[PDB]
Design a protein around this ligand. Structure first.
Ligand SMILES: [Mg+2]
Ligand SMILES: [Zn+2]
Ligand SMILES: [Zn+2]
Ligand SMILES: [Zn+2]
Lengths: 196, 56, 49, 77, 244, 378, 900, 65, 49
């Protein structure tokens, strides 16, 4: 299931981790989501961190944090009120591992980030066809998922199958599984013979 | 003499096709494997009867 | 939403790119991806017609 | 004057004899029409004084093998 | 040009008319535009380094005695198209106005679109990231419409517990996104967890999902028509017999 | 171990010539450092032979398809946009065998008498550089009292072209015998012999501007760079035939971006080498590493018939012997109709035709032939 | 027996052949009557085939779905010029005499051209060149060499109009329209001996057949008719075109039989010619395309054959296949690189057909007895005779009791089954690999992370396809050739492609860095997590607070083989003195003491001796993509299976390290002290002062033009260079003030994810925003935005952003960054299409090249493209960094092996 | 559209005190002190209570039957 | 009336399906625009009357 932040950070759910296995902070907060730290600096997404700090500050104080462009609440002010609230300025919190139970050697940055679920759900995107309806013209599997259609093995797939050197795999894919048929051919002239 | 990857794949495919419609296995079987696994064990034991014709 | 009569497959380097006159009229960031980038724009919040 | 074979981009060119041409045909089991072609108006051909119907043996610098031996067939324009 | 601008600011002529002057060393031209299709923006008129908008106008706007059309009528704020703005020198902030400045920007954050204003602190993000966030704001799920149950849309989505973001731009309240939210606030901790959040992936809490977080419902509408054919033949709404 | 024994072992080894000398040099270098024994050297030779045998490509590999994929895949992550127009457009221009590439650039090398001092390099660059008087001209004005161009040029530009105004006149007195050219200090004034209509004035004024005073035709910008304590001249435009025969330019290292000029001047072999070098340089500029074997195979396929051919419908695919191969890629209707006109017979020896029909392709396992002994007795 | 198509011979269909192949004659321009039955003599006649299930074909007696279809013929009232041959017809009209019919060449020239045709062989280009030369030579002769009759020039008007330039008795030159009947009569006079000179086969490509007298109407199956949801039949475009053709032909026949004047006959002939031309090709130049009653242009046979959606590309080269699935992918480090996560729903749908043998009889019987609704089960059963029965609840036990040797069971996807895993677009042969089926009860696909870089796939909603081979040969080919571990090294550059990325690199650095020690419980836990066969713990390196501690290098050493020794420098090198000392110590002894190495061990120099990591820290240079030396050596020296096991174990170990030690990034990672901010502001002020000085110098005229450049772009280049120097200085300051303890700096330096410029952009400055390689200039007159004075060329007014992401950009700088990002996005969106087109062109140019058994690459014709592939006969995949044999590595490894 | 019964993070019940919190917020008091006196101390429960907006009253008006 | 008060309107309902007319960014009618073609080496002015 596709979940996206408001700063272009998107991704599918990798694991449904039970609460007992999830880490928790010293304040007794268990995160509702865990994101990889590698994606934050590569895409130069500091607004996500500022939004996390602002969300934590808004939750702790009860007052909504303004995030308007160029007139929003300054980041340094947000860190100041986070410090005045009894938390670290950077937003990092001391977390304990949910499995081993030991304290993590690094203070983990945890905050409230607005994450929205998208309509690209895995329920409407899974397609699986073994055999079924075929087109009346080419005797090939139909189009799309609504009519139990097949999956297109395009020109590029054929090219990379040729590059792999798999002749019989290509024969099975393109011919033996899509539009295999038998015809009668006259050896004298090469015309298609007629069977009555 | 060595077997190329394409030659080995062709030999294994031919042996598996033979096993699927006859051609009893020349070695023991783990009682439940697919014919492809049977051809793989036949190749691993060095008991395959299929040779490769090479131009000369 | 605002579209353009130009073809989507055409590389329009001078047309798809953001213009300085789009300030206050065309949103500088909200554009679609792929061939629709640049040719499809959205009106700014202060845009008046 | 300026010899065309002194250029670093121009590999060495030699004229194959009839016996050498027959040996080349026998080695790869190919006919005279299955060799790569070179135009009779090519500057290397007119530098060698060749005529159509001959085979030019090219010693080229190989980035992977040091020296490589290619073969071409002189054909009319 | 000055007389036309003064008359427009005095309310004598309509605000649709826009006047511009091109003064080159070779050619000199005056352009007047009063047609359709011209995208314009509102700018506060600044004269002698002092903006026309005063605190009294803001108080009247807040009290409801003054409207936006009233402000346009007195020429305090005027609509400028691309042609007229070539002769204008706009000031980004009210504290940056000088004697040479001719206009004052109303809202620098208003240059963004409606979905682009959903992004909190867009100036702290990369431009492709802001573009992706603006594009994906339209793909989110939430209580878009209160009459979704009676609607007959072929496909629709509903969030069970939609939430207004805690870090939201003030324009979203005016736009109406706060009344119709399309997401939830997630307690996110940035941490590597067993490699299952690798390559943009995320890890969700099982108890949070079981508690109703990010729960959604998908509605699909099918239609059936009792079409009438030629000769009086028509479809029938009944359970088909097994013999057919 | 003596050097003679190592050389004899290297010669007796079943290794290529290029591997033999490199291996011998490395063994000599490592022999004094660690005092290698005879058995260690023999084991090293055996390991090298085994590695060479392992590195040999198995028969039946789809080298053309692999080369095409390995060239086109880095093009998906290249960067678009002196004036070298490198990147994906450069690769597209190279593989399409463009007769006139966009912004042609030639690399000019000088001999020992001009590659060590700046003055000789500048003078030979100005010899190569094609300077017209229109570029030297500063103001354009056509009058009526004499009804001809009175040309005034800035002297500073004349300080870079390295020639005097009067000699400039000598470049149009012989060339334009229908007009009289006069020099008045730093002003160039022309005189008409028999001119009375404005139509013929506009048919002869542009001929003076298009005339080249010195240098070679089609030459625009020209710069000089210091690489390897040597002066290298980079110019705009391709004039290989007129730049090879220059008194002061080394002709054994000069090259141009125009592969067609190299084919018509240095031969098809040098054209293939230049294609390989250009593709390698374009790949290395973008930071994407591509094996030179794929580029070499592509260039060999491009120059198979003795002339440079593109990879499109007018090139390698155009001269394909298979009708279905040509029809499947490009211009399907006219190719099929022309094949019907010629009565062409498709032997179906290719890969794409067998894909279209349903026969096994002649690559990889499709080339393996098997034999079976029937009396199997387990 | 069975036969295959050895070769295909092409030609032009003769009218006699069209008449003989036709099972019916079509004269009624209609398809169905009021009740829906076909009309006899119409296009939908049962003699040409049947589409509706109820009807039965008249010609062959078969029902719908099995009748191949039969062609028909229409006898045209007057001949019609075929458009596709039309221009070629004109060529013949310019080559043959108008009276004798022979070619316009002498007998000696004809004989010489015959010898030239025989000599050259079978190359197409030479044949076309000779044909063009012969046509050019014959077209300039106005006197027939055989008969002496005068000739006239012929003007060809597109598409099928021929004009003959004739002279009257008064000398006036006029144009006579050559009717198709006259053209066919002229073409009939050409003998068979002159046809090879014109490039026409005497027995297959007679020129008179190039003018259509009988039109072959296609079978019903090839142009099927369907019934819409409203009960109205929807006819095909070809059917409408044929209806129009039949109506016009019938009108022409009626007018001819009625003795209509010549104005009628030529007008109807032109209408029929236009209809036939549109039917052959509706996109012909010079004519209006045929349109439906709704205004939609029709696509005829030419558009059916050509184009991306045409038969050749959309149905023949590439087509939809059966037994395939497609869904979203999610990460799964717990599975091997050889395994793919297949959902239970997908597994119970896709079926592998397994023949019942003497060893798998019980398993397949259990699969049949389970049924389609129980896993592991079966869906279909095929008897030896060949009838397929679907397994329901009623016959599930009956079929199981009837199972015997020779039967085929379409069982559900089981563990260990080989399937194809492909992601689109497939730019390279590594974009699809054969994995092993792993069945998990969730909905999404699961793919191991090191296999992602081969697929170029992240997990931000990526969709991937899976293909299940059916035949045993296809399964064997997938298992042997396209297996994942067999394609670790990329043949494009001869380097590792299946490699650790991101968290793998970060965990390797965290484990192998100096001062990294782990407790006994942690070591046992990571050993169990990585699946290593370490029965007993090694000797602890040191004791802290009474408990044993193990160095991370010791734990990493267990992954490497015991006979492995390699040293190199990684990307973490910033003190070359220690690396030089380590290199010198290795150079002298060639077997340095492990205590001696550990005394001067440096994280910037990786050194593994006998499988023990004595020095160095793991980064992208260890087992990263395109950079991992250790993985490259392991693949080449220890096989692919050992390499796959090492990759799996090291990825699991690094994931365990990065999971429990704690890896995170926060807002303080980009934080800088006041001194760094002051230095950045000083650099900003210096850069703006330099830009202003350059602008003033350009305005006052003392700026010097660059050689070959005028003032404008010279000043622009100088300003851009100054801004680039300022950006480099700011980045250097940011790197100086950011230590290695920063996790973002760790990721940037180790090559896991991101770059140093990314951290610089979030901390120091955004640099200068440039469009198309130059400064931003598009906007108003003399300025980009109206917030700057006109004619201002300053840094702030041209796209130089002074602040970073952390400090926030000004609205003008935000707009400039938006222009830069839009330019980048447009650049990628434009580059992708051109790159794909170039890839397709290269593939179609080099599809048929193959290395033969003698090491030569030859085309299907037989021409030797290369006498040795790559001039040395070495696979680039097996090449060592583009070289034939790495003599240094071989010598060093052999020397170490003999010394140890 | 309706207040969740339990907090999404720890399952603490918050629907009981939400309407009192909303009533006190509309009275002009600081929502932080209102959350403090209602026992809502962890900011995850504060997130759930503050970010929720009531919308069921606008859905009940559209009858479906 | 079964309508959302927050619905902005501005669209059409054709056959029960909501249809929105995306604005079109066209050239100014009856206005002459001048440009130079580098490849053709000519000055071209166009007006869409
Ligand atoms: Mg993706
Ligand atoms: Zn039939
Ligand atoms: Zn004649
Ligand atoms: Zn809570």
């Amino acid at each position: 299931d596709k979940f996206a932040s408001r700063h272009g950070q998107k991704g599918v759910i990798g694991l449904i981790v039970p609460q007992e296995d999830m880490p928790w902070t010293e304040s007794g907060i268990v995160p509702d989501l865990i994101v990889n730290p590698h994606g934050i600096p590569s895409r130069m997404t500091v607004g996500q961190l500022i939004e996390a700090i602002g969300g934590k500050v808004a939750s702790l104080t009860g007052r909504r944090v303004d995030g308007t462009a160029f007139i929003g609440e300054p980041e340094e002010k947000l860190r100041k009120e986070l410090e005045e609230l009894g938390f670290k300025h950077s937003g990092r919190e001391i977390m304990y591992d949910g499995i081993t139970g030991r304290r993590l050697e690094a203070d983990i940055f945890i905050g409230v980030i607005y994450y929205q679920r998208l309509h690209h759900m895995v329920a409407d995107k899974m397609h699986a066809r073994s055999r079924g309806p075929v087109q009346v013209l080419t005797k090939q599997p139909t189009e799309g998922r609504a009519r139990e259609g097949g999956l297109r093995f395009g020109e590029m797939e054929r090219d990379v199958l040729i590059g792999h050197g798999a002749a019989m795999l290509l024969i099975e894919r393109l011919l033996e599984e899509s539009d295999k048929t038998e015809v009668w051919v006259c050896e004298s002239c090469g015309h298609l013979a007629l069977e009555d | 003499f060595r077997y190329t990857r394409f030659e080995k794949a062709r030999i294994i495919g031919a042996r598996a096709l033979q096993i699927a419609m006859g051609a009893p296995v020349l070695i023991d079987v783990p009682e439940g494997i697919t014919p492809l696994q049977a051809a793989l064990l036949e190749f691993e034991k060095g008991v395959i009867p299929i040779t490769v014709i090479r131009p000369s | 939403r605002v579209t353009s009569p130009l073809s989507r497959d055409q590389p329009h380097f001078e047309a798809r790119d953001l213009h300085g006159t789009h300030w206050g009229r065309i949103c500088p960031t909200e554009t679609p991806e792929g061939p629709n980038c640049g040719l499809v724009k959205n009106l700014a919040l202060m845009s008046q017609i | 004057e300026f010899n065309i074979f002194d250029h670093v981009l121009v590999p060495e060119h030699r004229i194959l004899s009839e016996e050498e041409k027959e040996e080349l045909l026998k080695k790869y089991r190919i006919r005279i029409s299955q060799l790569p072609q070179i135009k009779a108006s090519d500057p290397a051909v007119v530098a060698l004084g060749a005529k159509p119907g001959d085979v030019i043996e090219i010693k080229r610098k190989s980035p992977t093998a040091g020296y490589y031996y290619y073969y071409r067939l002189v054909v009319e324009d | 040009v000055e007389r036309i601008r003064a008359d427009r600011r005095a309310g004598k002529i309509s605000d649709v008319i826009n006047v511009a002057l091109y003064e080159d060393e070779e050619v000199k031209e005056v352009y007047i535009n009063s047609d359709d299709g011209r995208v314009r923006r509102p700018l506060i008129v600044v004269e002698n380094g002092k903006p026309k908008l005063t605190r009294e106008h803001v108080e009247g706007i807040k009290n409801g005695t003054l409207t936006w059309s009233d402000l346009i009528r007195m020429g305090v704020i005027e609509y400028l198209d691309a042609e007229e703005e070539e002769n204008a020198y706009v000031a980004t902030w009210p504290w940056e106005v000088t004697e040479e400045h001719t206009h004052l920007e109303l809202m620098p954050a208003a240059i963004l679109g409606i979905p682009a204003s959903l992004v909190p602190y867009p100036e702290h993000n990369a431009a492709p990231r802001n573009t992706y966030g603006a594009g994906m704001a339209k793909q989110s799920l939430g209580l878009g419409w209160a009459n979704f149950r009676i609607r007959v849309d072929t496909r629709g989505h509903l969030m069970h517990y939609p939430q207004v973001p805690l870090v939201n731009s003030r324009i979203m309240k005016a736009v109406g996104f706060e009344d119709r939210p399309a997401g939830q606030n997630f307690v996110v901790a940035v941490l590597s967890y067993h490699g299952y959040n690798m390559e943009d992936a995320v890890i969700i809490n099982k108890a949070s999902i079981e508690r109703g977080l990010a729960r959604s419902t998908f509605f699909r509408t099918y239609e059936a028509e009792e079409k009438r054919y030629l000769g009086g033949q028509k479809d029938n709404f009944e359970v088909p017999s097994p013999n057919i | 171990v003596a050097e003679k024994t190592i050389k004899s072992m290297v010669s007796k080894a079943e290794l290529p010539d290029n591997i033999k000398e490199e291996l011998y040099a490395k063994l000599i270098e490592y022999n004094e450092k660690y005092k290698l024994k005879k058995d260690e050297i023999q084991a090293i030779i055996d390991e090298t032979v085994r590695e060479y045998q392992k590195a040999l490509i198995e028969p039946g590999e789809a080298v053309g398809t692999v080369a095409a994929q390995s060239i086109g895949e880095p093009s998906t992550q290249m960067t678009l946009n002196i004036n070298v127009t490198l990147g994906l457009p450069r690769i597209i221009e190279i593989v399409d065998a463009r007769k006139n590439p966009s912004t042609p650039i030639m690399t000019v090398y000088l001999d020992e008498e001009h590659r060590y001092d700046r003055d000789k390099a500048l003078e030979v660059a100005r010899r190569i550089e094609g300077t017209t008087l229109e570029n030297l001209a500063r103001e354009e004005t056509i009058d009526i009292l004499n009804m001809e161009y009175v040309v005034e040029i800035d002297p500073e530009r004349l300080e870079k072209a390295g020639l005097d105004m009067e000699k400039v006149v000598r470049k149009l007195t012989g060339s334009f015998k229908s007009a009289e050219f006069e020099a008045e200090g730093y002003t160039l004034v022309v005189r008409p012999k028999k001119v009375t209509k404005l139509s013929d004035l506009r048919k002869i004024a542009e001929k003076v501007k298009k005339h080249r005073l010195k240098g070679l035709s089609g030459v625009g910008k020209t710069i000089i760079r210091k690489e390897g304590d040597e002066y290298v001249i980079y110019t705009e435009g391709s004039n290989f035939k007129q730049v090879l025969k220059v008194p002061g330019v080394d002709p054994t290292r000069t090259r141009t971006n125009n592969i067609w000029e190299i084919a018509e001047v240095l031969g098809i072999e040098a054209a293939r080498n230049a294609i390989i070098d250009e593709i390698v340089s374009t790949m290395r500029e973008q930071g994407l590493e591509v094996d030179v074997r794929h580029i070499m195979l592509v260039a060999d396929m491009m120059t198979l018939d003795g002339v440079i051919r593109p990879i499109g419908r007018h090139g390698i695919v155009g001269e394909k012997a298979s009708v279905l191969a040509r029809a499947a890629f490009e211009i399907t209707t006219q190719h099929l109709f022309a094949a019907a006109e010629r009565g062409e017979v498709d032997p179906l020896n290719g890969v794409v035709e067998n894909v279209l029909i349903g026969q096994p392709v002649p690559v990889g396992t499709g080339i393996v032939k098997l034999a079976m002994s029937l009396p199997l007795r387990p | 027996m069975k036969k295959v198509i050895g070769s295909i011979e092409f030609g032009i269909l003769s009218p006699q052949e069209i008449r003989k192949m036709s099972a019916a004659e079509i004269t009624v321009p209609d398809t169905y009557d009021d009740d829906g039955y076909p009309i006899e003599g119409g296009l939908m006649d049962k003699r040409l085939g049947v589409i509706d299930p109820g009807l039965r074909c008249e010609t062959c007696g078969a029902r719908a779905g099995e009748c191949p279809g039969h062609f028909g013929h229409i006898e045209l009232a007057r001949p019609v010029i075929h458009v596709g041959f039309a221009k070629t017809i004109h060529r013949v009209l310019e080559s043959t005499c108008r009276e004798c019919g022979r070619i316009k060449l002498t007998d000696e020239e004809i004989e010489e051209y015959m010898q030239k045709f025989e000599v050259m062989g079978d190359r197409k280009g030479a044949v076309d060149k000779l044909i063009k030369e012969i046509h050019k030579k014959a077209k300039e002769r106005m006197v027939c060499p055989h008969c002496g009759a005068p000739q006239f020039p012929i003007k060809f008007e597109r598409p099928t109009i021929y004009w003959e330039l004739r002279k009257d008795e008064e000398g006036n030159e006029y144009k006579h329209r050559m009717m198709p009947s006259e053209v066919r009569d002229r073409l009939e006079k050409i003998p068979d001996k002159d046809l090879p000179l014109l490039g026409l086969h005497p027995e297959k490509s007679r020129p008179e057949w190039m003018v259509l007298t009988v039109l072959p109407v296609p079978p019903v199956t090839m142009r099927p008719s369907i019934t819409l949801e409203s009960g109205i039949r929807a006819e095909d475009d070809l059917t409408h075109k044929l209806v129009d053709i039949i109506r016009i032909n019938n009108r022409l026949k009626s007018n001819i039989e009625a003795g209509a004047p010549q104005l009628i006959i030529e007008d109807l002939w032109d209408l029929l010619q236009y209809h036939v031309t549109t039917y052959i090709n509706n996109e012909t130049s010079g004519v209006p395309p045929a349109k439906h009653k709704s205004g939609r242009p029709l696509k005829t046979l030419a558009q059916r054959l050509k184009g991306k959606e045409g038969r050749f590309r959309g149905n023949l080269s590439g087509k939809r296949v059966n037994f395939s699935a497609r869904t979203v992918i999610s990460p799964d480090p717990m599975i091997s690189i050889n395994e793919v996560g297949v959902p239970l729903a997908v597994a119970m749908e896709l079926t592998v057909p397994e023949k019942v043998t003497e060893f798998n009889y019980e398993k397949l019987k259990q699969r049949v007895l389970n049924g389609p609704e129980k896993y592991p089960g079966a869906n279909y059963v095929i008897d030896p005779e060949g009838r397929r029965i679907r397994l329901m609840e009623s016959n599930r036990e009956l079929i199981a009791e009837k199972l015997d040797i020779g039967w085929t069971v379409e069982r559900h996807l089981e563990d260990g089954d080989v399937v194809l895993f492909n992601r689109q677009p497939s730019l390279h042969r590594m974009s699809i690999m054969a994995h092993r089926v792993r069945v998990m009860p969730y909905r999404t696909f699961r793919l191991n992370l090191p296999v992602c870089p081969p697929y170029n796939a992240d997990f931000d909603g990526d969709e991937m396809n899976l293909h299940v081979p059916q035949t045993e040969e296809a399964q064997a080919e997938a298992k042997i050739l396209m297996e994942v571990q067999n394609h670790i090294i990329s043949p494009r550059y001869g380097g590792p492609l299946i490699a650790g990325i991101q968290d793998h690199i970060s965990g390797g650095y965290l484990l192998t860095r100096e001062g990294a020690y782990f407790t006994r419980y942690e070591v046992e836990q990571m050993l169990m997590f990585a699946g290593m066969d370490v029965n007993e713990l090694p000797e602890p390196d040191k004791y802290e607070n009474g408990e044993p501690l193990w160095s991370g290098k010791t734990i990493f050493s267990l992954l490497l083989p015991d006979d492995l020794t390699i040293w190199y420098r990684n990307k973490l090198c910033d003190e070359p003195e220690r690396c030089e000392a380590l290199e010198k110590l290795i150079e002298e002894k060639l077997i340095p003491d492990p205590e001696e190495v550990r005394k001067l061990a440096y994280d910037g120099f990786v050194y593994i001796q006998n499988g023990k990591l004595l020095s160095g820290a793991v980064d992208k240079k260890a087992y990263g993509r395109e950079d991992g030396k250790l993985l490259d050596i392991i693949v080449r020296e220890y096989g692919v299976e050992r390499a796959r096991q090492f990759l799996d174990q090291v990825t699991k170990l690094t994931i365990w390290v990065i999971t429990h030690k704690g890896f995170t990034t926060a807002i303080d990672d980009e934080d800088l002290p006041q001194e760094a901010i002051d230095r950045i502001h000083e650099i900003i002020r210096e850069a703006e002062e330099k830009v202003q000085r350059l602008i003033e110098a350009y305005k006052r005229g003392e700026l010097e033009p660059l050689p070959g450049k005028t003032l404008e772009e010279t000043l622009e280049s100088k300003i851009m260079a100054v801004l680039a120097e300022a950006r480099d200085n700011a980045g250097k300051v940011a790197e100086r003030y950011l230590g290695m303890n920063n996790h973002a700096v760790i990721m940037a330096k180790t090559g896991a994810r991101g770059k140093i410029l990314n951290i610089t952009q979030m901390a120091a400055m955004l640099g200068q925003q440039s469009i198309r390689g130059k400064r931003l200039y598009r906007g108003y007159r003399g300025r980009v935005l109206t917030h700057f004075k006109p004619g201002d060329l300053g840094a702030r007014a041209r796209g130089f952003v002074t602040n970073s992401y952390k400090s926030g950009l000004t609205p003008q700088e935000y707009f400039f960054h938006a222009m830069g990002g839009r330019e980048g996005l447009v650049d990628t969106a434009v580059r992708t299409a051109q790159s794909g087109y170039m890839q397709r062109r290269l593939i179609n140019a080099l599809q048929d090249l193959k290395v033969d058994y003698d090491g030569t690459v030859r085309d299907p014709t037989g021409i030797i493209v290369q006498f040795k592939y790559g001039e040395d006969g070495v696979d680039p995949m097996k090449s060592w960094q583009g070289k034939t044999v790495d003599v240094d590595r071989v010598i060093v490894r052999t020397l170490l092996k003999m010394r140890g | 559209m309706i207040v969740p019964v339990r907090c999404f993070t720890c399952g603490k019940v918050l629907a009981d005190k939400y309407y009192e919190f909303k009533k006190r917020v509309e009275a002009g008091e600081d929502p932080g002190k209102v959350l403090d006196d209602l026992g809502v101390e962890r900011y995850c429960c504060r997130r759930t209570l503050l970010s929720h907006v009531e919308l069921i009253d606008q859905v009940m008006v559209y009858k479906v039957y | 009336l079964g309508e959302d008060p927050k619905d902005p309107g501005g669209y059409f309902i054709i056959n029960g399906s909501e249809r929105v007319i995306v604005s079109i960014e066209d050239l100014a009618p009856n206005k002459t625009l001048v440009e130079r073609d580098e490849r053709q080496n000519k000055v071209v002015a166009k007006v869409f009357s």
